[PDB]
């Protein structure tokens, strides 16, 4: 057959690992969609059916964009009385939830609980990365690379070094928003300062939830900064420079990694 | 005949194994069908007999050689030639039984085992589970000779099954899972011998069902979760394509896309 595709009921996690939430669980038309700490209960307002017809539904109503301009908010609304083009979203494999008529993406321009969701111009930013799951906590992996060495954080600095099975400094949290976080300061994010070659990648505050803080583990084993289209690179195949950078893709072993859990 | 990809354990390096597993992958599927960033093996329906299999020739620094046939539609070993004698796993099905006769044409004579090449049967003939059969360039070397001498009558049955369990994971399962390829690569890196951890067992147990869940997935999210294991025994579920993209490299074709 053609692949049936099903209608999974699922949470949607995003910025700083919080959930897509109908505010206060009031399903009146026009009420806002917010970021809220992911619950562990049955409450329908963080549970979303991904319908065959490209609608995302909670309790019966449709996730709906208030409009088609950047910055306008997203509401729960009756699926039949709403504008059909405002109820349709594509969930992408690189983590972005886009509204086709608008070409704008479900966004969380702030990281605090209660933040109102918006649609913004897509810049593959951490504020715009989502994932549908009932798995509330992030994926904690070591990240093995060149010469079988491990990605390691030490305060702001990050480099690869010999893999020690203890070392918490080598544990990483892959967040639903596409950020890669040091296990010991989940407030902080694997970060590129610039969209240019040989940008040295650091650990900084996730505060900005920026394009340079979003990553995707790809099928060829690279790790891609979506906005820049560059990938993680052990600079010059030299661990001892203690510098992981951004570099156009060529696929040699200094750009291949693997999430070993 | 069919494409043949060559590997050797003599001076086998991290390069030599890495380039081997790619070559096998690039010969299993054309890379034409890809679902949510993961390549799909060919569909058996519509695939002609002449492009049904590929062969991998394995040799030692004892210079023994042995040719294994993989079924391109599932990347799994169906049998092996060794000099002038071929041996085949018990085909689960008659149309498989006919595709089988199209391989190793010239062999002095064929043999078909009574048992299939699936882990459950294969472990009980070896008398030990995957959890306890070490893998690495060493074990593969031993396994290559054990397959060669079965023709001679020097390899006892539990050792032949044990040798099969080694080759299937370090060839087929590694070709399916970059994850598993990396676990083998780690062993070649430090020249260690090591039975697979629970994470590796589980992926290979889950391959068929992961192939189904990704291909029937709506937009990446699964209808039902799939349970996996960390390198400790501890458990955790996957609901979505996204973490699998770096972990699975080939899928068995299960349906057509829209």
């Amino acid at each position: 057959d053609v692949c049936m595709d099903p209608e999974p009921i699922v949470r949607i996690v995003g910025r700083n690992g919080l959930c897509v939430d109908v505010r206060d669980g009031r399903f009146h038309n026009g009420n806002a969609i917010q970021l809220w700490p992911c619950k562990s209960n049955t409450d329908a307002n963080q549970l979303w059916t991904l319908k065959r017809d490209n609608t995302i539904r909670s309790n019966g109503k449709c996730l709906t964009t208030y409009g088609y301009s950047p910055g306008v908010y997203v509401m729960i609304y009756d699926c039949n009385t709403a504008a059909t083009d405002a109820t349709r979203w594509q969930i992408w494999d690189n983590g972005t939830i886009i509204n086709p008529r608008s070409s704008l993406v479900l966004a969380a321009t702030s990281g605090n609980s209660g933040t109102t969701l918006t649609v913004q111009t897509n810049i593959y930013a951490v504020s715009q990365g989502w994932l549908p799951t009932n798995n509330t906590q992030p994926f904690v992996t070591t990240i093995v690379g060149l010469y079988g060495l491990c990605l390691q954080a030490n305060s702001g600095q990050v480099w690869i070094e010999d893999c020690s099975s203890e070392k918490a400094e080598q544990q990483w949290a892959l967040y639903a928003d596409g950020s890669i976080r040091p296990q010991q300061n989940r407030d902080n994010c694997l970060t590129s300062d610039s969209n240019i070659r040989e940008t040295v990648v650091k650990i900084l505050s996730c505060g900005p939830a920026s394009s340079g803080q979003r990553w995707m583990f790809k099928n060829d084993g690279t790790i891609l900064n979506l906005y820049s289209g560059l990938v993680l690179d052990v600079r010059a195949s030299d661990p001892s420079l203690k510098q992981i950078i951004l570099y156009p893709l060529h696929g040699d072993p200094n750009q291949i990694w693997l999430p070993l859990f | 005949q069919y494409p043949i990809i060559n590997f050797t354990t003599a001076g086998a390096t991290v390069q030599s194994y890495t380039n081997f597993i790619r070559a096998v992958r690039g010969r299993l599927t054309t890379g034409a069908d890809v679902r949510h960033e993961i390549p799909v093996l060919p569909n058996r329906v519509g695939l002609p007999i002449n492009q049904r299999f590929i062969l991998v020739e394995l040799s030692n620094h004892a210079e023994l050689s042995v040719t294994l046939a993989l079924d391109v539609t599932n990347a799994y070993v169906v049998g092996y030639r060794a000099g002038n004698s071929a041996y085949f796993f018990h085909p689960d099905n008659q149309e498989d039984a006919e595709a089988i006769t199209h391989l190793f044409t010239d062999v002095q004579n064929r043999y078909t085992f009574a048992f299939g090449g699936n882990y459950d049967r294969l472990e009980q003939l070896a008398g030990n589970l995957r959890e306890n059969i070490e893998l690495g360039n060493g074990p593969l070397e031993e396994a290559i000779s054990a397959l060669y001498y079965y023709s001679t009558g020097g390899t006892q049955l539990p050792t032949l099954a044990r040798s099969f369990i080694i080759c299937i994971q370090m060839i087929s399962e590694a070709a399916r899972f970059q994850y598993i390829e990396g676990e083998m690569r780690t062993r070649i890196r430090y020249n260690r011998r090591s039975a697979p951890d629970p994470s590796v067992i589980t992926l290979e147990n889950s391959w068929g069902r992961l192939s189904t869940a990704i291909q029937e997935s709506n937009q990446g999210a699964f209808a039902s979760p799939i349970q996996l294991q960390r390198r400790n025994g501890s458990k955790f579920s996957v609901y979505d394509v996204s973490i699998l993209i770096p972990i699975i490299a080939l899928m068995v074709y299960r349906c057509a896309p829209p």
Partner: nanobody
Amino acid sequence: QVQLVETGGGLVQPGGSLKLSCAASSISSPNVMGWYRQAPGKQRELVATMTSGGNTYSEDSVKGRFTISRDNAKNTVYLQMNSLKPEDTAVYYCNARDMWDRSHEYWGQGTQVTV
């Protein structure tokens, strides 16, 4: 096992130009071959190295001024250098390492560029 012989160390005033050469004795297939440099008292620093497949990593301070070519035929790397600053004054080491084994890394023993 592999050995690297260097050339081109010189004696220059600000604004000159210096080219450095390096020959090698084959190395594993995806590799890099380039130049490092160390002025006494300070630590060793990459200046430029090229990949097996023609891509190069270089240091910000030196880009534009410095050109790095290879030919791979039998293991050559060249470093071309203009707008010479008294800051480009160090011992320059030619380097070659592959990308599969950490061990397989090889150095010359430097040429003193004085500028």
